[PDB]
Each structure stands twice: as structure tokens, then as C-alpha cells.
């Protein structure tokens, strides 16, 4: 337990002691609330304390007697909600009981108080939600009603309302709940609110959705009044725009009006009675019936024509007759018509009754009835969608009529929106575009923007139209003469809140600026200022600012800058008053400074300073209104200026930290909310300044680390500020080569971060950002960990993972957990202990003890190491037992009374902890291996099957863990999935999701398990044949179709996505299609096209199905509906890139080239075109955009456009530049398309280009044209980037003079701003570099523009696309030697060396793979070609500087792409052989393999992705081979990645060809690598990768190369012959040679023949122990290791020697027999490898001691025992070795007798001396204890030897040896002899 | 000691977990009491986050008598050096109102709310202590 704040007690006593007397009760309760808030890190504990102290009786009496006090309600709600949170986590049933019984009544009393305050509602709502989760829900009915009353009160925040209406809806699902609502005010209450106080915000729509869901359910218990239908309809007309609401209204009506009523009305209308009677009545009824979309069809069956009848004949003539009456009828009809234009089939009906004419003519009459005209306008929009129909409509001049009317009648709100809607859907058609433009054009629509500025729809329509029209404008006159610019500025100015319309407004201001006579009308400043202001209000909106800088770049003048800058200080001095004045100047400065040409003025006057000083003057002063605002602005103004500028920032950074630490900051922020105040704005700003990495200088840096620490010291309680600070530390830490860590060390910053994390454990945001800062530094400096352990970072790490079942966190807290990692031996210790304790509790039937200890053990497996250890310690086998015990000891668990968890809870909890353990272990490849091998997939299936009966508290918790451990295992081994695939298990799994029908994790993991086993077509057929699975499909579709929860629908869809995506089988797709998914999913996109999450998720699933299914089938082979729907989503979703991607994907699968007419008619191509333009930089949009346009006949269109370009150039028209520009636009989209016959489609490319280069030369400085020509050239080049024989690509560009043209333009510095040119221009240059025949010309023209290329990178340093394009160019260009010289000797300046500039840009865009990948690839390419062309190594790569910066640019969550680039960079440095010292120092090879092993563990990437990493890594290792860096590898077992590549990717040939090549290169390099290749790798190739080697040409050839290398050395041939599988592969290669024939096959056959000959011919002589000695001895004297674990050649050497010796050792040898002389070398051999402690274990795993000792006892010849002695002597240099030998019983007596034998011998003195020194050395070594030799005559032999020295027999050396032995064996027992 | 931001240490070192060895480093609150010898010094401690830490110590210390004392000592000190006599303050606010009257006579509104608070309230207010 954690202890509660002590103040809780005092607070509570206050609340209890004063429940009558209110003034203080509130005070106390306000204080309890504050203790009970997430501000405090102990609110849960605080909450429970109050409960146990019985505070709720007091809160209960309080809220009854003082019902009214809104403030008591807020406090009460807060404490209870806090209790709710605690009892949910602390699952104590008693506490859950108490809060149910004693707590819910008060929450209820709060809700029946009818509160409007968001917080009190959120809380009591969140209270209700948590209690349900705890398993003690609050009766919906009780809350219903009180919840309705909330709407009796207005002033209700739409956000809160949206939540309440959702909650009413769930309550209404019961008749009980629905009646409660009827008993209180019925539908009216809600509906009235909706009508009166309802808005059209995305929230408001979600609110009304829930209101309509409420009603629906109420109408199905007849709890509906009679006000409902009229009101519902009123509410639908209010929301008609938004289809999600319209649909939920219709659904509600259908539950209220049965089909019988339809029948009645319709037939009654067939019973004529025309004229009042029941006809004109039923007529009114039909009106209503129309709204019910489910009845639209039946209405069309018998009717649809009556309507036009009632319009034309029955009204047009009599219009002049009876205006008022006629009008009403006309309208009602027209509207119904609009309402029934649902499906394309329905609009079909309409044209069959000539609706277009009738309606078109009606307009001509209803020129005076606004109402009727709008009704017509409304009934036309659906018709005017169609193109064929639109041309009819211009022949009626109806556009030409409605436009002028709108203009004059715009103030009237109905007609405006409805006319505009029509002009809008009209403007989508090129033919009309012109017609309109002619008649008063959009000079009226521009003006019209000035009105209805709050009507998003209206404004949207209008501006979308104007953006379809102003392109085709010659002059800006008129629009000015009318005052339309001034009207769009109005719209913009009035829409600070609608990000959407605000965007469009400036896009249109942007587009106005592209007209020729723009300046003439847009240099008033008015516009300038508007855009500037728009820009600062809408910061976070990328597209808006970019569009604004463009507009400004065009019309802004320094004459505008001074008009602001010359009043700056005056405005700052007068900021207390007129804060709006200075607000403007700030916004101007902020914006105009993103224009590179203009920033200089501000730079010169040092405005940033002037502003920073103002900020200070605005804080350290008497507070004033507008203070916060102007400050927050100024902060941004300063931030932006620096960001668009180029200086170092360290000054400004400090200035900002200084501002944040001004004393008055606290007082200024207390009138604000805690995460939008001048403090967080400042911490945000400076963080952003750090991101730029422009903090350079070890002094300059210290300042910043200090300044940030101060900020966090002054303001402990501003959580957002602390976060922004932590984040900021990170960027700083990795500054100045990453040296920052050192500073942070010295400054004490690290301990700060640790002590924050410890102090605020509850804030994950903080936990992650904090440990992030830690992990970063750890990865940049060693010993950082020391400090961390010394700072108790462990205590933190633990409570982190122990309070966060998350992921990203764990990922971050991993490197620490490997540095701190505890003693690690301790982890091991504890893990073994806990396993034993778990096993004991099973053997002893202590169910509680098992639970307690499993949970303990689960706390140690959160670590990659924990898991890896548990595997080694046999957790798999243990789990089998734990499971067996649990399953068969349930009723034991149930009976337990004396434990924290009791009842089923205990049982389920224990399975849960059991499954969890396995889930966790399976986080690692090791773990999955061990788990699987132990049968643990069955174990899990047994656990899962153990859960049943009353869902317990942990039942779900338990299911989730079982299913997740299963998911991981089945996904990770195909065989293991395929073994599990049994009908019964499928049934278990399906039934599982029924048991937890509302659990999304259960459904997710179940579906993953299912898909993972359906690994082949047959299994899919079998899985789909299971009724339980078909039911599941039917059920998933059901949720998608009916469940009003957005989150449910998403989950049901993600579940389908996974079944079809993993399985990727047509049969799956077909079953899902047949369960109704296709139509359900399309319906999502129809109703929710305005919801990105939904639209995307639906499109993703539609797209997968679409690969297999012809989606028209589900619409009776009419494409129109699915097309219409997708086109409309693409419209609404145009700016969201991932949404257009997936929509375009569906369109491309839906449609065929046989649908052109259809696709013209529904305007699909227009939208695709526009999507491509908006997302020009997107690989996927362009590609899919291309595939769609290929259905329109691209081959022909390219031919056509290309010919038109040529013709218009040769005409010399005045229009020419603009005409060629539009043509290039069009040509560029088609060039995205794949072609049937490129040689025919592209035939005119070169001439066309010639025409275009001429055009540019003629008309310079045409920004649009420059871009489109470049775009054209890019797409041309891209089509064939890699085919150097293609003539239409880089070839055409270079031969046409276009390449030299572009080079010139950059060199002319005239285009260094047209980002729309530079991008594709540099891609074009890239393509010319990549084409080898173009490369000489690139080199020719490059010197002209390379210097400027540097300038661009500095100028557009903040634009990531531009940087990537240019860095990509440098990368491709650096493949040429001469080019490499130019780069390094032409690209320097402020940012510095090109390599420096590259790091600077990478560091700035760490989040952008495109920049970082291009960056790293460049560095490597440059590094290599330089080394090859003589240049000396880049210095800043060689000092490790850049290797580190690159290492820091890898996140824990880094793409496969970035990992690949990083390898490529290192591959190239290794191939350069120039940077080996630096690569070794940074442990580059190690860190790459760590990255990769980590990735094999967590399996974050796909299989295709990891395959590619392994292939790449192989190549790294081959480079390492060629650079002589084997040995660095055998440090960290680098060979192992090659073995792993074969095992996981033996079936993938693009890996294996690399593995083969890498093995060959590694072998040539290193004799040990060779050995491993033979003994370990080739066995694995010939089995696991045999199928690849025999069926893929390159695998076969590479494998034969590898073999040929291996057999070239003596001994290898023989071994390779024994390899199992080799033969099968070799003859399969043979067969692959026969198949290919020609030259390739001949040489392949010959390769295998040579291999076979080399293997037969490999005949090494029998080897002798003497060879073993000669190799070791030579190794030794050249200082090479002789540790077996480190040197692979030695393993075979030591094992021959063990065995050869052992057969020798059974005979009595002679020092003069060949055999016995060889036995000496064998011991000298042993002597040398017993000199390295490393070899001890292995040696003693052959009882080395025993063998040696035996020889000493047995053998007769003194000279063979000598060498056993010398060798064992050396062995016992090491303490454990000694101990062992000594322990061996007999040892002392035995070696002692060896001494005697020699002392008694008649050997010559010189020989006796050598023998005795050896023997006495052995006794010295083996006498580990002075007592060991007690029972022995050693002292006599030593003494005897002494007395022989005395007789002049020996030298002094002996005495020394005797004296050494004596001192080791002297004891009580030898005193006599001495 | 001021020139090298010593207050940065005396603020930090005082916010820690408690424990008998650390209760002693918090006894180093004394160090802070002995250094803060004037008004200017009290304000320097505040500018270093003194007020927020002392508050956080006082509030955690119900069951820590030794540090409760040492920390209340520090705060009483801070208050003392920053709080003026009710009289001087009363005088200050009368004056403020006088100025107000003068301008109006020539040209009656209220003194600036914050200026008025600044003159009338004790050190707690000047040092940025809030009601809660």
C-alpha cells in the first residue's frame, strides 16, 4: 500500500464535524476535493482514506439539504469520482460495495440537481462509467431524467452535451429507462434544446446524433409523444448538411412510422380525391414520409412524377394566378424531390420525368419567391452533379438567372445557402465554369463571402467554387470593382475558430494573387494584414501558413514592413491600452519574417530584442486586460523569427528562460488554466528553439541546461511546463556532438530528472519524456549509468513499469534496465527463487502462495533480460506444472478465506498472472523458442479453457493475457500455428468473444490468432467452413451496421481488416463480402465521410476486399453508388493525405477502363486530379492517382497533350506561356499513369521538351510554369529512373537541353524560391546522375550551380521536402569521382562543411525519414567515392563525431527505412576501408546487431521488412570482412546474425544470395570464420535454405562461389562431403544449370563439378598431437588468444587432442617410441591451453585433472610423466582449477610419490633437477591448504632433495623450488621432520 | 554566494524523500534561515523557487516535527523581512487614494487594483503566496 496524505484526515474531520453549518463544510470539502485530484500523486489513496473514515454520510446529508449549492455539487462529484477511479484499480469488493451503496446515491442526487458545469458532469459521468467497469453499475434509469433536465437549462457546453446525449441513449435502451424519460419531460425537452441551442460543430453533430439515437430507442417502447415527429423533422432540416445526423434522424423516424402508414398514404393518393379531400392531406403526409430514407424506394415505385405534375402544370401557369399559395406547394414538392434523390437509381427516375426541364423552367417563374427558388436550387444540386445534365441546364440559362438574384438577395439566409450550394456543385464542371464566368462570374460569389460568415457550409461552398474559377481569370478587376477581396478578408477575419474555412479563405487570397493585375488591387495592405493576422491565430495549421507565405511573397512589400516596424516600440509603450495595436504589429512581424527577402529589415532593427524587452515590461507590471494575449503572441513572434532566421539561438534561448522566471509570472498565470498560460507558452517556445539544434558552444550550452533547470526549480507544479522542459533537455543533451550529457552530468541535471520522475510517478507523459532524456544521454556517454544507480533511478524504473501497463514507456525504459539492470545476477537469483516458490506452492496445495509468487515473478519479466533469463531457467517446463495445478485445484482456490483476493476472483487472477508470465517471456525470440519447445501453446489453451462461469473481476484480464501470449506465439512460428489449427480450438476462440462481447482486446487478439493459423488456402476454406466463424463475420458486420459507438465500429472494422489482411486469401475476402461487409463499409463512408478515423478504417477494409471482389456485384453491377460515395469522401477529405490514399485505393479497385463515361459523369477524375495536386509530394497519392487516370487512356492523352504543347509553342501566341502551363499540369498527371506501350505514348517526348525549354527561355520568371515544367520532367524521369536504356527519361531531359536549362536557372539565382520548381528540378538532376550516360553532362553543368545548392539548403532549411530532394541529389551525384571533388570544394559557408550542413539538417528534421535517410545515404556515398579517388578521409567522420550524431538520430521507434539507411551508410564506410578506427571506437557493428536483435525480439516490423534488414546486414558484414574487422565481430557474436538470417529467411532468396556472399567474404578474411561457415553455416544452408539455392539463379551461383572458396583450403573438402543435404542441393543446382543453359548454366555446372572434384581430392594426412602443439605454440608466440570459446579453429584441434591422447593414455608409453614422443607434444599442447583461465571449464568437462593425475600414477617413463606434470601444474595456476585437482582423493599422496620415485631414481643429476622442479611446482600449486599434504612424506622428499643439493648435485634453482614447496605444506604435522 | 546562485542548492536539497541521514540534510533548512538576513535576500530566495518548496515541505511534514519546525522558522523569517507595519501600509494606501483624487480634481476613480494590493498587503503577498 501507499500511505495517504495526512491532511486528508484533518480535511475529513472538518467535513464530518460541520455537516449542518455550511460555510465551513464546503471549505473542508473543497480541501478534500483538492487532495482527491490528479494534481496530487496520491489522490487514489487519499480517496479511499476518506471512505474508510466514513465521509460519505456527511456528503450525503449535505447534498440533500443544500441541493441548490452548485459549488458543493462540484466538490462532492470530485471526491466520489476519485473514489470511483481508486476502487476500479484497487479491486477490493468491499470498497466497491461501499461506493455502490453509499456513493452512487450522492452522484445520483448531483445528476438530479440538473448541473450545467462541465466538470461536475464529466466527473459524475466518469463516476458512472467506472462503477460499471468495476462490476457494480449505476441503474441507468435513476440517472436518466435528472440527466434530461440538464437540457432544461441552457448555456450547455456542446462538448458536455454530446456526452450527455450519448448517455441518455444508452439509458433509453431499456423500457425502464425509456419510460423514466417519458415520465420526466419526454422527447420535446431534448429535441427543443437541439433546435434552440444546437450548433453545427463536429461536437454539435455528435450531440444531435445521440439525441436521435435516444429518440429511436424511445420510439421502440412507444415512449414517444406527438411532438417528436414534427420536431425530428425540424431538426433534420436544421442539420441537412451533415449526413451522420440526417441518417440517425431517419433511423429514428422508421422506428416511429411503420410501413403500413406508407401503404395507407400512397394508396390514398392513388384513390385520387384530388383537391383537399384526403389527397391534399395525404400529400402533406407523404412530405413527412420522404424524410425516412428507408421508404424512399417504395415512394419511387408509385410516384415521383406527381411531384413534377404538382410543380409545372399544377403551378407554373397559376404562379401569376396565386403567388403565395402556389409558391408553398412548389417548394414542398421541389424539396421532397431533393429529399428522394438518394440513390443514383432514384435520380435516374427523375430525369425520366424530365425533372431538369420542369425545375429549370420553374426557376424562370419563381424569380420573386426566394423560398421556392431555393427549393428549386435544392432539387437541382443532385441533378447538376451529373455532367451530361449540366449542359441541358445552361441551355435554360438557369445559372445565368440565379446568380444576379443571389447577388441582390444575399442577405436573406435561406436563398443564399441554397443558391450557393447550386453555384458550387455547378462550378465543378468546366463547361459551366466559362458560362458562369461570362455572366457576372464570381465577382458576385467573392462579395457574397461578406455575409453568413458563421455558416461554414455556405462559406465552404462559395470559396471552393471561387478556387475553381479564379485560376481562369485574366484580370482582378470586377472582383475589385465589386469588393470581393474585401469580402473574403471579412470571411477570413470572422473565422478564427473554423480552421477549415480560414484555410480556404487564404488559399483564395493566394489564388487572387496569381492574377496578373494583382498588386494593382492587393497592395492596399488590408489584405496583407488580414493574411498575417490569419496566420498567427492559426499556428498549428501547416497548409494555411505555407499558403500564406506564398500570398505574401507575392504581394507583400518592404513598404508594408516599415508601416509596422516604424510603430513597433510606440505600440509596445502603449500596450496596457490598445493591446490590439501591438497584437497586429507582432502578427505582421511574425509573418513577413517567413518571407526570406523581407526578414532582413526586422533583423537590422533587432526587432526580436525590442519584442523580448516588451514581454518583460508586460509581466513585471500592474496586470492589465490583454496581457496574457499579447505576451503569448510576442513569444510566438520571437520564436518564429529565430526559426526562419539563421543565427545561433543561445542568447535568445536564455532570454526566454529569463522571461519565464520573472517573479510576476506566477501571479499572471493564476487567472488562467494550467496548460494554456504564458509559462507553458514560453516553455513550448524555447523547447522549439532547442529542436533547431542551433545551440553551439560548451559555455553557451551550460547556460541553457542551467536556465532550464532553474525554470523547473521555480515551478514544480506546472506539469505542462515540466514536460516542455524535459523535452527541452533531450534536444540540448544531444547538442555540440552530443557533449551536452557531460554538462547535464556536472550541472546535476541528471539527478534532477531522476528526482522529478520519482516525485511525480503518475505522469506517464513525464515518465516517458524524462526517461527519454536519460536513455538519450546513456546512449551518448558511458558511466552515465553509474550516476543513475547512485541517483536511485532503479527505484524509479521499478515504480514506472509497476504503474504503467503501457508500451512506449517500457520501450524507452529498456537501455536503463540494461545499464542499471540490477546486479543482473540478482535478477537471476530472484527469478530462480520465485520459480522454486511457485513450484513449492503447487506441490503443497497453497493456491494463495502460487498467486502471490506468480505476480512477484511477473514483476521481473518486464525486462528483456528477465524474460531471457526465465527462458534459460526453464520457465516453460514450470508453466506446464503451474497450469496443471491451477486447472485441477479450482475449488481449492474458491474456498480460500485468508487472502487479499478471494472467490473466483482468486482463481481467475491466478490464471491471469500465469498467462501474463508467458506473454512477457514471449517478448523475446529466446523466450518464444523455450515456451514453444516446452509445449506452452497447449498450456495456454488449457488456461484459456479454465475460464468460465460468472465473469469474475479478473476473468477478462485473464482472457486478454491468454489470447495475447497465444497471438505472439502463433504469429511467430508458422509450424506452431499450423499445429494448433483444430476445429475445436476455433470453436473455443469464437465462443471466447461471445463471453466477453464488449471486450475489444479479446476480439482483437482472437481474430489475430484465427488469421495466423489460416496460413494456406485449404486452412482458410476450413476456417470459413466453421459455423462459429461465419457467425462471427455476421456479428462483426452487425456492429459495423447498427452499433452507434464510433469506437465499436472502428474495432469491428479493424477486426475484419486483420482477418482479410493477414490471411490474404480470396476465400476469406469472399466470405466477409457475403456477410454484407461491402455494403456496410460503403455505408460508413456515405454517412461518415466527414470523419477521418471512420472513413479511413472503412476504406482500408474495402480496399483489401476489392483486390478479390468486384465491388459492383453488391450493387447489381452499377458502379455509381460506390463511386459517388467515394468521390464525395475524397472531396470532404481532400486535405487528409492518408484518407485520400485509402479512398483512391478503393476507387482504383472498384473501377475499370470500361467506366470512363460513368467516371466523367460523376466527376471522379476532376477530384482525383485535385487530390494529386494537393499532395504532389506523396508517393502513394501520385501512384494511385496514376492508376486511376490510366483507365482514361493515358497513352493517347500523353500523345495528345504533348503534341498540343509543341503546336502552341510554334504558334507564338500571346496567351502561350499560360496555355503551355495548363497543358503541363494536365500532362504531369497522365505521366503518373502506367502505360501499355511507352514507345508509342512517349514518342514525342524530346520535341515536346525542346518546345518547353524554349518556352522557359522566352518567358522567364513564370513561377507556375517553372514548377509545372519541372513536374513534367520529374515524372518523365521517374517512370524509368533505373532503366539507363530508356530514351524518354533522363535521356530526353539531358539531350533536349532541359538539364542545362535547369542548371542555368539555379545558377541564375532567379528561382531560389520556387519550391515548386526546385523540388522536381533536383529529382530530375538526381535522375540524370543515376543514368550513367547522362552523368558526364551532370558533371559538366554542376559547378555552375553547386554553390547555390548550398545557399538553397540554408534558405529552405525548414522545408523538409526541399531538403530531402537536394540531399537525394547530392547522394546520387557523389557516385562520380570528379563530382565528389566539386562537392567538397564548392559547398562551404556559415552552416559549414557539406557534411556539417548535412548533420545540421538531419538534426533539425529528426522526425523526417526522408531527410535523415537521404542524409545518411549521402554521407556514406561521399565517404566511399572520396576514398576511392585519392581524397583523404572526411575528418569529421573519422573522429567519431558524425557516427555519434547519426546514432542519436535513431529513435527506439525508428522506421525500417531509417535502419536500412544507417546500415547503408556504415556499409559504405567499411567498403571505403578509410574509417576503421572510428567505426571500432563507436562500436558501430555492435550497435547495428543490437538494433536488429531487438527488432527480432519485438517484431514491430513486417516479415518483408525484417527480411530486407537481414539482407542489408549481411552486406554490412561482408564489408566488415573486406575491411579486416572480423574479430570485432567475434566479440559480440556477429556471425550469429548470418545464422539467424538463414533460419528465419531460408525460403527468401534475396536474403540467401546475400548470406552466401557474406559467408564467402568472411571466410576469405578469417580462418575461424571459415571454420564456423563449414561446421555451422553450410549445414544450415543445405537444409533450411536448400530450396532457395536450387530454384533461384543467384542463390545457386553465390552458393557455388562460397563452396569454391571453402574447398580451396586443405581439410575443408572432406568435412563438407559429410554435410547432410549438400548432395540434394548440388544436384538441384545442377538441374538449375541445365534449365538455364546458355553461358550461365555451363559455368554453373562446371562450378559444381569443380566443387565435387575438390571434395573427392581433399585427402589430408593423419594429424598428430605434435601438430596441435605447433599451431598453439605459434599462436602463443604471436600473441594470439588460445581460448577455445574465442577461436573456432581450436575446437576441432582440442577435440582431436582429447580423443587421440585418450587412446594413447591406455598404454604404457616410452619417450623414444614415436607414439610416446607424440604424447609429450600432446601434454605440452594441453600445457599451453591450460595457461588461459578461459579454457578451464571445458578442460574440466573432460576431467582433465583425473586424466593427468592418472598418467602421473600409472606411467613408468619419468619423461612422459614430466609433461603430464608441467601441464597440470599450469592448469592449477587458477584457484578453482587447483581446488578441484586437490580435492581429488589421492592427489597429495600421488604427486608426493612422484617426487620420491625421482629422488630414489638413478637418473643423472641434470635430469633429476628438471624432474623435481616440475614435481615440486605441482605440489606448490596443488597445496591450496597447508593441511592438505599432512598425511604424506612430502617434507622428507623435499628435505632429501635439499641434502642432495648440499652434496653439490644440483643448482640453486632447485632449492628455490624446494623452499617454495616447503612454505606451502608446513604445518603441525611436519614439525618433527623439520 | 549570491553571485554563484547558492540558493539553487538550498531550494533543491530540501525537497527530498524524508531517512534519518536525510532528515539531517533537511535540517540544512537552517543554512537557509541563517543566510536570509534582509528583505533583498528573502526576495532572492523566492526568485529561486524558495516559496514553492517551503510550502511543499510544510505541507508534507505533519508527522515530521523536526522539519516542520525548521521550515516554519524559515517562512517566519521570510515573512518578517518582507512584511511592513500595518501602519506604513495604511499610510501607503491613503497616499495612493490621494494621487487619485488629485488627477480627478484637475480633470473620482479607483487606484490600480494591483498597485493597491501591493501597498496594503504583507510579505506573503509580495512573495506570491496565494489563498489556497
Numbering used by the authors:
A (entry chain A): 7 to 1880
B (entry chain A): 2193 to 2210, 2213 to 2301, 2324 to 2348
Study text:
The phylum of Apicomplexa groups intracellular parasites that employ substrate-dependent gliding motility to invade host cells, egress from the infected cells, and cross biological barriers. The glideosome-associated connector (GAC) protein is a central bridging component of the gliding machinery. This large protein composed of numerous armadillo repeats (ARMs) is highly conserved throughout the Apicomplexa phylum and links F-actin to the TRAP/MIC family of surface adhesins at the plasma membrane, which targets host cell ligands and mediates adherent anchor points. GAC facilitates the association of actin filaments with surface transmembrane adhesins and the efficient transmission of the force generated by myosin translocation of actin to the cell surface substrate.
Well-diffracting and reproducible crystals were obtained at pH 5 for native full-length TgGAC. The structure was solved by multiple-wavelength anomalous dispersion (MAD) to 2.7 Å resolution with an Rfree of 26%. The electron density for residues 7–2504 was of sufficient quality to facilitate modelling for these residues. The remaining electron density showed evidence of peptide backbone but could not be confidently modelled and refined, indicating a degree of conformational flexibility for residues 2505–2639. The crystal structure of TgGAC7–2504 comprises 169 helices arranged in 53 consecutive helical bundles that resemble ARM and HEAT-like repeats (AHRs; Kippert and Gerloff, 2009) linked to the mixed α/β C-terminal PH domain. RI (residues 1–1665) comprises 37 consecutive AHRs of approximately 40 residues long that are supercoiled into a three-layer pyramid structure. RII comprises 16 canonical armadillo repeats (AHR38-53) and forms a superhelical arch that contacts the base of the RI pyramid helical regions. This interface encompasses a surface area of 1550 Å2, with AHR1 and AHR17-18 from RI forming one side while AHR48-50 from RII form the other. The interface comprises several prominent electrostatic interactions (K2254-D11, E2436-H24, D2330-R629, D2346-K672, and D2197-R716). Remarkably, the overall architecture of the predicted structures is very similar to that observed in the crystal structure of TgGAC, as it is characterised by a series of tandem AHRs that are supercoiled into a large ring and is closed by specific interactions between N- and C-terminal AHRs.
